[PDB]
Amino acid sequence: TLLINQPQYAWLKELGLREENEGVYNGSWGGRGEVITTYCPANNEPIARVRQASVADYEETVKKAREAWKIWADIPAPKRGEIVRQIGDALREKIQVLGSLVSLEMGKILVEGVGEVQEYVDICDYAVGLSRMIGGPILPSERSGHALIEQWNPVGLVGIITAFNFPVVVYGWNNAIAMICGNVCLWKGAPTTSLISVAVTKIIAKVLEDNKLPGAICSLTCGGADIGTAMAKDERVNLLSFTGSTQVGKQVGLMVQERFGRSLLELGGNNAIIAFEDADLSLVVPSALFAAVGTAGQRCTTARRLFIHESIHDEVVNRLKKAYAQIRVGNPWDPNVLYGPLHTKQAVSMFLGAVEEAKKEGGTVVYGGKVMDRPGNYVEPTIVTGLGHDASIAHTETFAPILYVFKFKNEEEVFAWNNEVKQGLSSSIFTKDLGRIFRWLGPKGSDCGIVNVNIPTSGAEIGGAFGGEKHTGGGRESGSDAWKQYMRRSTCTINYS
Template sequence: HWRMSRGPSGTCVARGLFYQQSAAMSTLLINQPKYAWLKELGLSEDNDGVYNGNWGGKGEVITSYCPANNEPIARVRQATMAEYEETVQKSRDAWKVWADIPAPKRGEIVRQIGDALRKKIKVLGSLVSLEMGKIYVEGVGEVQEYVDVCDYAVGLSRMIGGPVLPSESKSCCTLFKGLDSWQSHRPGHALIEMWNPVGLVGIITAFNFPVAVYGWNNAIALICGNVCLWKGAPTTPLTSVAVTKIVAQVLEQNNLPGAICSMTCGGADIGTAMSKDERVDLVSFTGSTHVGKMVAMMVQERFGRNLLELGGNNAIIVFEDADLNLVVPSAVFASVGTAGQRCTTTRRLMLHGSIHDVVVERVAKAYKQVRIGDPWDPSTMYGPLHTKQAVDQYLAAIEQAKQQGGTVVCGGKVMDRPGNYVEPTIITGLAHDAPIVHTETFVPILYVLKFQTEEEAFAWNNEVKQGLSSSIFTKDMGRVFRWLGPKGSDCGIVNVNIPTSGAEIGGAFGGEKHTGGGRESGSDSWKQYMRRSTCTINYSKDLPLAQGIKFE
């Protein structure tokens, strides 16, 4: 079988012909009694992959597969370019309605979306687990993040806005010695900052968080007064359809245009069209650095806006004074969680030379206790990789690490069971600047590095191209604040005594350098979905001009 090249979602853009033929010949999971719950989400054997107030889909039919057994779940009809054009136009028309609604009222709609998601949280979380492959508690937790961001956005809808700035009431300047001084007065003037929605926000999400990343963008963009066009990953289309059905029902119940939250399932053609389309005011892209760079160039070519959430080659640094009872579970959680497929996954574990051996021994022992199984089994801690392509990348990375001087101390093999299961792996003995260490591989491989000084560790943290998440474990408060300061970590997420993953929604999420620079979710991330205007208002009967100029 074959797969097409990576598209602007950062994932495979299509399944091979072999898969589609086999899906037609085999029994879809949705028709099996064990998976009858899928129909509670409005899913069927064949699903429309376009929503713009009406459901449709006349493009390629793709089959979604379960990574735990590689069996077909159901089919989705993707968008054609004609349907994309229609959807963008309907989205622009819907914005004219949505932008006129007061922000607190928009917040009320987002609150209702959060409540609707709450009612479906377990079944939707189960779908995430089935289609993406992450364990059930992570699938439910991902939907909970969308709910939490909705709650956050409701409060934000009554708080967004700009300041009233002090206007100059008097300025003095002596031009030249011997000349009279002049004075300029501006009484009766107000200087304010206005924030308005950008318009249409295109949201391109990746397979690893098929609900949460859309939720971060969607909830905040909506309360700001924008409409959203979503293109999810081609390998998780059922999740995109199910979420959109929930959101669409809320809009319909409030007599609002469905195109406020539109969706076009598709591959590279749709992602490219969104990136090049001047009607899409902001493109929010989550995926690989390679594809993100292509998206950024297409958007910048038309002087559009982009919000990029790309890769991360994240490090945990453990100093000699660290509490190892915090270190070990943190390292295990952050490196094997979601089978190493989080952008915040710990990929480099830097250990002070004095504690290197004992930490490696304890982490390896903990790895062997990780319960591996079906992702929907509540006792499972570790599920499959998302695709067979990822399994190939896992094997290739291990081989490269060995060639570059690494030693596999734990794991390193594909598991003999159905699905895309691999052993979580620990590799020691590599140089900090080994090519494979500097390569972000979206699989559960942890490279353990040995350092001696603080300066060395901080430098190694910053020497990779990405700059997403980082953490140190220490009791030295001076070191903590050096780590947080200008010569410390250059990442967007800088932690102390906690893992690199597990960010809270109240903070701005994102990173620097090849991670893209975008920020989503909390803090003032809402500003990325709006345009700013500085406004000077003269409410007097006079017109004082700059530099004291007067017209007689």
């Protein structure tokens, strides 16, 4: 009854997956911890099994990663970029089947599963050039006969903990950047996307082995909170990149700070869209729909609060309701499907509780609010009106497709309301007003790390640094000078007189 044993799913074997797969890689494949089965969220069928990491697997892997660092750190950065280039090519050759696996194990629709692999490919190609660019300025010393140089060196071992909802590209951003910066990596992915983690690691392992490099440069220890906690407490993990819930990330941040390590935290969001009276409503409505219900509301940048000018509130809500009723629901790998299941049954339960709480706090469900009666974890995408902007349920991140809608009148109050929550990830305003747009970007505007105009809260590109502020944790991934978080700066003065 395992999906991998059905001919309909024989393509899983093109990723080198079988019934039971080793979930530890450090040059060798292993796994002496508990064997986990992962399940397809569209039908609750089991796919295949992964042998997770014991404590002894973890300990051996960290040691092998740190020995491998001695070799890797001596490789010139541009030659490390060539390795990353070859990783991108190897992902390229498996983009369709790996994208299908993302749809199957995680449950986002196919164009997004494939899109996620493509973005990993693209960050690899970007990192190739960046590997010839990382560094600091040589500055003029104020003293005769002295040179003044800013040097950047790898931090060493970069632990990477990733979440279920982007099970390929978050790791990929961290991996590609950490690698060209001279670090080795230890990945612990979400347990419910273990096959995805294993499949990606197989692809990278083959590149490293073909180049006669130690496999531990990109190590894998599949596991749950125990492995993640060990990494947070582990002084040999020089940088811990964590993507997950604010609640867990706060504890990881504390554990890393207690040992004077470095952390990079990419936590929850409670992202607002604001539609002013002059907004192009044929941009607002489809943008709100996609930002709120894309990936069944399970992006960290998912729109969860919609503020509408009172003059257009009713019209936007009515047009949003009609658009919701037209959303094509089905298996995430099927053509024309735009909306798949929630990732787990626990997520369905949390969705139901939020909807209940929203009614108890005085909200009105104007669309959805129910669990769909069908196989898998499907819930109706939901719209709630009538709550105050400071309703407790609206200040909570519920990782489900629920959109809280609010009226406003003036710019100043609704900029404050965007900013009042604890999260600080993404934000967008819809307006044509030149002044309002620059005030939004300015010091009295949005306090988030992603600040958008006439486009949804999701959809960032790799060219810029990605991450948020306040309880979103402050880390940055991908573009701009985000690479500096993966290295250590030294200020070096050479007296040559």
